[PDB]
Structure formats: structure tokens, C-alpha cells
Design a protein around this ligand. Sequence first.
Ligand SMILES: *[C@@H]1O[C@H](CO)[C@@H](O)[C@H](O)[C@H]1NC(C)=O
Ligand SMILES: *[C@@H]1O[C@H](CO)[C@@H](O)[C@H](O)[C@H]1NC(C)=O
Ligand SMILES: *[C@@H]1O[C@H](CO)[C@@H](O)[C@H](O)[C@H]1NC(C)=O
Ligand SMILES: *[C@@H]1O[C@H](CO)[C@@H](O)[C@H](O)[C@H]1NC(C)=O
Ligand SMILES: *[C@@H]1O[C@H](CO)[C@@H](O)[C@H](O)[C@H]1NC(C)=O
Ligand SMILES: *[C@@H]1O[C@H](CO)[C@@H](O)[C@H](O)[C@H]1NC(C)=O
Ligand SMILES: [Ca+2]
Ligand SMILES: [Ca+2]
Ligand SMILES: [Ca+2]
Ligand SMILES: [Ca+2]
Lengths: 516, 484
Amino acid sequence: KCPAVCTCTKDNALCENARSIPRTVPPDVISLSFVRSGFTEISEGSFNATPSLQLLLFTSNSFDVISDDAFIGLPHLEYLFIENNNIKSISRHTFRGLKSLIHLSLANNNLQTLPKDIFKGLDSLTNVDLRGNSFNCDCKLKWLVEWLGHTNATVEDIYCEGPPEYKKRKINSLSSKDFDCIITEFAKSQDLPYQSLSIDTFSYLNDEYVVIAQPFTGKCIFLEWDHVEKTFRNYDNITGTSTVVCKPIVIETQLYVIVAQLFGGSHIYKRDSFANKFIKIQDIEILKIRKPNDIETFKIENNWYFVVADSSKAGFTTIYKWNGNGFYSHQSLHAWYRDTDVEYLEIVRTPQTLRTPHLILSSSSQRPVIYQWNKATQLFTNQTDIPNMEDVYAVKHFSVKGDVYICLTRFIGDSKVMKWGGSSFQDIQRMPSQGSMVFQPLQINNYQYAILGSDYSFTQVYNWDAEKAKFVKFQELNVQAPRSFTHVSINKRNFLFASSFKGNTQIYKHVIVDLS
Amino acid sequence: NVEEETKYIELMIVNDHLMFKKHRLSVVHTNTYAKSVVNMADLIYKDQLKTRIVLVAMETWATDNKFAISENPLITLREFMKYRRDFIKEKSDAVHLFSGSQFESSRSGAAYIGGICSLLKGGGVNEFGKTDLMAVTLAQSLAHNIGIISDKRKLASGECKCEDTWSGCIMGDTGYYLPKKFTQCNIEEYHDFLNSGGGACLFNKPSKLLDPPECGNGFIETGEECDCGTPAECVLEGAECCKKCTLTQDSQCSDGLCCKKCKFQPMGTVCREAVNDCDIRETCSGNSSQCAPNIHKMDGYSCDGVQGICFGGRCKTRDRQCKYIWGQKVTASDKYCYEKLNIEGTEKGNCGKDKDTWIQCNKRDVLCGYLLCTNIGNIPRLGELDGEITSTLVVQQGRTLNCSGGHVKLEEDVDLGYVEDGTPCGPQMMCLEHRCLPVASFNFSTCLSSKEGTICSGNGVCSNELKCVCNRHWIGSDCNTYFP
Ligand SMILES: *[C@@H]1O[C@H](CO)[C@@H](O)[C@H](O)[C@H]1NC(C)=O
Ligand SMILES: *[C@@H]1O[C@H](CO)[C@@H](O)[C@H](O)[C@H]1NC(C)=O
Ligand SMILES: *[C@@H]1O[C@H](CO)[C@@H](O)[C@H](O)[C@H]1NC(C)=O
Ligand SMILES: *[C@@H]1O[C@H](CO)[C@@H](O)[C@H](O)[C@H]1NC(C)=O
Ligand SMILES: *[C@@H]1O[C@H](CO)[C@@H](O)[C@H](O)[C@H]1NC(C)=O
Ligand SMILES: *[C@@H]1O[C@H](CO)[C@@H](O)[C@H](O)[C@H]1NC(C)=O
Ligand SMILES: [Ca+2]
Ligand SMILES: [Ca+2]
Ligand SMILES: [Ca+2]
Ligand SMILES: [Ca+2]
């Protein structure tokens, strides 16, 4: 029955001075105790063929590592005590496989660390005792701070023994602050030989593609993910002359690409599903649209629209509604001005608690104008202009929490962010730059960035500081003549596309070095 | 050759009150801004048209506008030229207005076509923009003054096309990307304007400039004995003559049309030959390095033989008017077509228009009525066609003659398609107000002549200055003294 190396009882057993766990236990034995055993390590997948255990304990042993799934084969296990040993590290999934565990004690073995979510998989837990360990409080203990507040199980208080700046401090008392475990970087991945004016992304049949407008070949370039090597490859082209903006619009699982050209341009294309080739559908009126500088896509109350900015005095900036078979003229705006950019944003306008669709378009040598959507007349009215800001090339918007901000691009002088107040934009941050043709906010994995491009100088990447409530200098990219910046998201992968007017286009990887 | 010669546009800029406010009511900021705009426009004209834009004077209004400014650029142009006629006394080839207001119109400016060096038509109107945009706006307005037109007919044909696809040419619609280059057809139109007798003034070289005088700029200024220009330009001509704008003691002639080997060309040497029937050959004074002021025959001289009369150095005929509006393939209709169609007073021909009424052309005055051209295309060269072209055929002496016309409007106030004033309907008769009137009626001034029944005694020709230009071997006030 019981091996003579270890003391036993009818319903109980106590083992001491053994280098290996006995292979066989009598069927009625339940609880097992190992004291000062010569174990080098726990056996991988140990405690097989001993299902009856309701309790187990180890004391005063020497364990360098406790392997994953060491406790599998114990469906009836409830109390687990591992304490008063010397242990350096244990694996995360060691406790995995026991959902019946009730009480657990890691106390007083002088553990300096624990792997994240070691306690995942035990949903029956009530009491846990970590006391007595020397706990270095760092990124490795951040998950444990998250776990202390979210667990219903009672846990006696434990203290930080390190780093010495935090000493005898309760791990329970810590909060989301006082932790910086994450930094971010943009590293160059691919270099595209062609120069580009604009880059855009779209999702067709749950597949995220990229459209790049190359001005000097007139081509509208399409890039698709390739799993075998680097994902970006060129799958298709649309041919045009002097293509400026290429805007894909997917409507009810049907792809439309609006491409603006400077030579007899402004054509609307659709993707034919069977042939999987782009087919010219409509031609935008050449008298209304002449020198388009921009295209903005937006959807309001289950209706799709797009608007083209005309920088010619003769042409008019025009919004095009979708009747379901195609795009047709809806409203002309800002007659006899030179329109460089159009921007759509939904902002709360006091008194209204609801957000309302708005337009912001930038006229050359003029102040930016804001249009409020009127639901009753289905038109933009109440033209209002951003005060004390002139020669704005473009306006882009981002939101932090509930508030919304805008990045205004001024080619000369300061380009500055502004926050939407009740009736107005208040000045927030002022950064001067030379030759800035783009100021682009980007949000990647809840990280707000602002990239400020420059021709004569370096492109300056900024990060949003929640505590400072302003953008902070972050990184400096080198790109020849940035006209645009686009965030591309593959599955769990993220990229940054940087257009270059006078040079080759840049593709940057989004790299996160992170610990817990 | 007139095309080879360098042409100089003396330009005066008038800044309205809104332009002054845009510059924060600073005289230095306004003057430096305008100077920058004119300098860039000068770069374009120097590169393309072999023409230099010189700023002779500038008038800025610190107080409120003298005349009410208008949203319509054509209306503002009329008021501005009205003001500049009655008020501005400064000498300039062209007077352009910089307006802080933005005109509501397809145009960013308005300028009279071929109006250069007219006191009434010599001006232009330009809306406020950035320095580069203002330079292009000034370039296209001055282009209209020097006779550069859109020429819609050849554009629709495709023969005339700006070969820059990304950015247009100057005369086209201006987007965010600005044009620096003129079309070749624009060049040909400018040269045709020069060859027809337009812009004679442009050949005068500016003596005084608004900017403080600098040596080596190519223009002589008070206190400057000579200017040969840039050292390379100096090496080409006038290197030995002129150094540091100081005449070398040996040689008082540095660089000029009448200047050769650093010595004055003898009197009577011909610097520039006449470009047409109306032009008069200029000759070297012998007292000046520059050639004599460009002059032309006085109004009323016969051009193209019998068919035409000279006005402003330019020949006015119905044929040239037809070829102007409807293109070079057109020719003037036969006189019978005028005679039969105009007397009818219908849409097909008339002496004029009244509200809800058509004016029957009087029997006496016909060739002064509705303009009829043999072969007419659908699209006019300039202006916009109103209505549809009118076509009527008449047969005289067993041969059918096709005679057509159209209503073409440059602006709402002035309507083309009617015979221009001054056309010779009949011998000693000029077309005026759709009527043939004896030349004596308006009493053209003539140059002095000793002999009766001759001009300038018969030894000379009358000029734009009303002075006799004598034939070789004849000299005098009246050209009546024999001096071989
Ligand atoms: C865990 O907490 C939730 C509320 O946060 C409560 O509804 C639930 O009953 C608790 N479960 C246990 C086992 O205490
Ligand atoms: C797409 O266009 C690029 C040049 O912009 C060209 O090199 C490439 O071959 C094209 N791909 C096609 C036509 O599939
Ligand atoms: C703005 O729109 C409101 C209706 O939404 C109207 O009553 C008001 O007169 C408008 N204001 C201007 C300046 O057009
Ligand atoms: C030649 O010109 C000078 C001034 O340029 C003048 O003083 C002189 O009298 C002239 N000689 C003539 C006209 O014979
Ligand atoms: C006569 O004029 C009409 C204008 O409508 C034109 O269509 C036709 O060709 C002309 N016939 C000629 C020039 O013989
Ligand atoms: C025209 O002027 C001349 C003098 O130059 C005069 O004799 C004649 O009467 C004038 N004619 C008219 C109609 O006034
Ligand atoms: Ca946009
Ligand atoms: Ca002149
Ligand atoms: Ca000089
Ligand atoms: Ca002459």
C-alpha cells in the first residue's frame, strides 16, 4: 500500500525526506504533505493517477521552478498550500486545470514575482494568502494590483518590499497611476518607390485594403496584405490623369471609389463582384468641380454623402448624396472661394446635449468656416468661422474622452490644436512649424498621436498626455515631403503610412515593447 | 522685329482701403507687398513674353475708398477706370487696382482686352490673394491688356492646349497649384496684338522707377550716366562703354537700340520698321541711345488699301473684325448681303436693338449695321455667344452668297457682332452709331501742310502726336523744305 519512505495514515499521509513523489497512493488517502523533500523540481504534469486528493501541501522544500499543468489530474482538489519554501519563479498555467480549488496559500515562501493571470481558471476560490513574501512592485505586479480589486475572494493584505522607494506599502492601496510599463515607436518597415499625394483604407468583405493616390503617374494604387512575406503588395491599379484624392466608399457590402483628378477628372468607380475589376460608373460635373483638393466621406442618419473641395474660384465645393443607385449633387457650398480641405466632425453644440454633424472647410487666405447640419432642411446652414486663425490649409479632429479637439494646419507660422467649448474652439496648444502641409491625429490602441509634417524640417510625431491634457513631443520621422498620414490596421498588426510628394512613400511598423 | 525686341510695361498700382486694412494700415507693408506681387509677375512675363513689368508709381488709400466698390468686378472696373481718368494724372502704361474685397464671380479679376496704354481701357482690377496668387491674377489681367485671350474656339478644337496637366497655364482656372507658364497660343495672340499695332507705348523704356535707383538693373535712373545691366548682360553689349553706371570718357553710348560701338548712331538710322500700314518707322535721333518713341499714323489714314481706316495704330475693317470674333478662316460678307439683309430689320439683320423691337437698317447706312461674315463657326473666339448664329443666303448675278452673323457679348454693357465705330462704310465716311457719316462731321485734326489737298505738303505722314514725319531728303515743320 503506502511506500515505506513516507509516513501514512488510513485517510491521510505525511511525506518527508523523499526525492520523488510516490507513484501510488492508497485509494482512501486524501490529503498529502511534503516536508523538506529533496525535490529538484515538481514533475511536469505530476500527480497523475491520484484523483482523490481534497488537500495538498508543501513546506520547507527547494523548488527552482514549478512547471505548467503540474497539478492536472486532480479534479477533486480543494485546499492547496504551498508555503515556507524558497522559490524563484513559477509558470503561469501551473494552477490551470483546477476549477475546484477553494483555498490557496502562497504565503511566506519569499516569492519576488508572479506571472500574470496565474489565478485565471479558478472560479471557486474563496481564500488566498500571499503574505510574508518579498514582493518587488513593478510591471510584473501590475496585473496583481488589477486582480486584487476585481476578485471577490478574500485576500489578506500584502506589502511592497521593492523597489525601496516603495517599501512596506500595501499592494491593495496602489492605483492605475504610478505605472509606466509601455512605450511606443514607429520603425520603418517598407519603402515604396512611388511618390504619393494621399493614402486611404477600406474594409471589403472583412478585408482591409489600402488606396494610394500617385499624382505624377495618374494611377490610383491599391495595396493588399500578403501573408507569405511582408503584408503590403500591389494587387490592382486604377488609371487616371493627375489623380489627387482617391477615396474608397463601401456601401452595403459594395465598393465605390471616388477619385478626383486635375485633368478632366472626378469619376466615380464601383467594384464589380464577379469580374473583381473596377468599372467607371459616374462622371462628376466638370463645371461644378474643377481643381479638387480634397474629398471627405461621411454618413448621416443612415444616408451616405461625400464632399469635394474645389480650390478654383470658378468651381464650387459640392456635397453628393447617395440615392442607392449612385451619387448625385446635394448641396453646393462656399461659392467663389478657394477650398483646400473639407472636414466632417460630430460635435455637441450647446444647448443641445446630442452631438450634431458639422462641416469645417478651409479656404485659402481665409478663415476656416463651420457648417451645422440642419435635419429639417437636410442642408448645412448657420455658417460660422473660426476666429483669429487665417491661411489654414486643413483641419482634422480627434476626441479624448467626451471632448473633441481639432488640429489646424497652417503652412506658415503656428499650427495649433483647439478644444471645442460650448459655442467656440478655445486655444489649447501652439506648435510652430515651417512648411507644414499636414497635421494628422491618429488613435492606435487607445493611444492618441498627432503627426506634424514638414517639408524643410523633420516631421514631428506627438503623443497625447492625459495628465497634461496636451500633445507632448514624442518622435521625429524622416519623410521627404509629407502630404498625408494614414493608420492601417491588419489583424493585431498596425502600420503608419507616410505620403511623400517629392520622394518615395514610407511604411512604418507600430512596435510596442511591453511588460504586463 | 517687334517680337524680338524687349517690351516694357509701366505699371501703376492703386490699393483700395480694404487692401490697406489687410496689411494692418501700414504703408510699408502695403508697398512691400505690392512690390513683391509685381516682381513675381515680372518674373513670369520676363521668362515667357519677353516683357518686363516695371512699377512706376503706387497710390494707396489710407482713408475710405474714393468710389464705392462693388461685388461685380466688371462694375468695379468701370468705376475704377472712371476714377483713374478724372483723378490719376500719373504717366503709366497700365493702372491696376488691388482690392482687399473678394469679387463674387468666376473671375478673380477683370481687365479690358487689348486696352494697354488707353487712358480709359488701360487698367485692370484684381481681388486680394496671397502673393503668388496675386501675381498670377495680375499676370492674367495684364495679359488681357496686352491682348492675350482665352480663345475658346481653338480650346474646344483642342489645337490650343496647356501642356501642363498638373497645374494649368495662367489664363486657365487657377487651383491650389499655381501656373507659372503661358500657352504657346497665348504667345501668338500677344504677338498678333503687337503686329496689329497695339501697345506701341510698350517699346518706350522707363526713365524713372518707384524703387530707389540701383546700378546694374538695366534701366537708367536720375544721376545714372548709363546702365548696362547684369555683368553678363554688360559683356554682351555695353561692357566697354559703361562701368558702375559711369560713362567712360571716350563713349557716351553704352547699351541701346540706337547705340553701336559705344557711339551714337547717326541721325536718320531706322531702329524699328513699321509693323503695318498704320505704323510709322521710328528713326535714331543721334542725340539719344534709345530709339525714338514708337509712333503711328494719325487716325483716318487708309489701311489695307481702301478697305480700312487707321485708329490707334490699328486697322479697323469689317474683315479684321470678322476674323477677330469668329477666327481666321472667316472673311467679311459681300456688300450686297449687308444691303439686302440689314434693310429688312429682322433677327437676320438690323441696325440695332430696342426692347421688344428691332431697328430696320436705314437705306443710306448699311455697312455700319449688323456684322455679317461669310463662314462662321459655332463657337466665337472670344466672348460668349448669345442665342444662335443667324444664316441667310442671297444670290447676286447668278452666284449665291452666304452671309451670317451672331451676337457675341464680352460684357453685358458692350455687345459685339455690330460693325465697330470708324469702319469706312463709304469714301470719306466713317461708321458711327450704326450710321455712315462723312469724315468731315467729326473733324479729324490733321498735320500742317503747305500745299493744298496733301498731307504734310505731300512729303510726309501724319503721326499720333500730330507732327509731320518727313520723307527722305525733305525736312521742316510742314515738311516743305528741300534738303537732300
Ligand atoms: C462577485 O461579485 C459580484 C458583484 O461584483 C456579485 O454579483 C457576485 O455574487 C460575487 N460572487 C461571489 C462568489 O462572491
Ligand atoms: C500599378 O502601378 C505601378 C506604377 O504606379 C506599376 O509599377 C504597377 O505595375 C501597376 N500594377 C498593375 C498594373 O497591376
Ligand atoms: C441660423 O439658422 C437658424 C435656424 O436653424 C435661423 O433661425 C437663423 O436666422 C440663422 N442665422 C443666420 C445668420 O443665417
Ligand atoms: C544732345 O542731348 C543733350 C542732352 O542729352 C542736349 O543738352 C544737347 O543740346 C543735345 N544736342 C543737340 C540736340 O544737338
Ligand atoms: C452658311 O452659313 C451657315 C451658318 O449656319 C453654315 O452652316 C454653312 O456651312 C454656310 N455655307 C457656306 C459657307 O457655304
Ligand atoms: C469743323 O471744324 C471746322 C474748323 O476746324 C469748322 O470750320 C467747321 O464749321 C466745323 N464743323 C462743324 C459741323 O461744326
Ligand atoms: Ca479629409
Ligand atoms: Ca511705356
Ligand atoms: Ca540703373
Ligand atoms: Ca512705329
